[PDB]
Nucleic acid binder design. Structure first.
Ligand code: MN
Length: 108
DNA sequence: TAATATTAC
């Protein structure tokens, strides 16, 4: 698994972490480049189970080399990892159901 | 892409 991107769009299905607790763990990820913006939202699956979406904007492009680098812990929570094609589309998408938290400053 | 999974611009 390989991604080189400035902006990451993450989706954690069947995830019971609070949005604040997931934001906390992602803030404390040691990455070479600095995180300028993290937004985490909590939404519900059709069966009532919660999941999270995350937008991370890094200061520069970040080479993800490992499919588990963004795994979170309470059980272990594994996300769908994609490079955000549009940071502004994702920002809107993460905000749409109203239950989200931000860290940092949104970029460009 | 893996590896959560129907959730993912
Ligand atoms: Mn959702």
């Amino acid at each position: 698994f390989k991604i080189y991107a400035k902006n990451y769009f993450l989706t954690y299905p069947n995830c019971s972490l609070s949005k604040e607790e997931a934001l906390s763990q992602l803030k404390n990820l040691e990455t070479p480049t600095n995180k300028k913006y993290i937004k985490v939202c909590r939404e519900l699956h059709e069966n009532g189970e919660p999941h999270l979406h995350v937008l991370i904007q890094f200061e520069g492009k970040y080479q993800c080399k490992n499919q588990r680098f963004f795994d979170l812990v309470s059980a272990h929570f594994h996300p769908n990892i994609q490079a955000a094609k549009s940071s502004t589309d994702v920002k809107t998408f993460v905000e749409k159901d109203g239950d989200f938290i931000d860290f940092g400053v949104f970029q460009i």
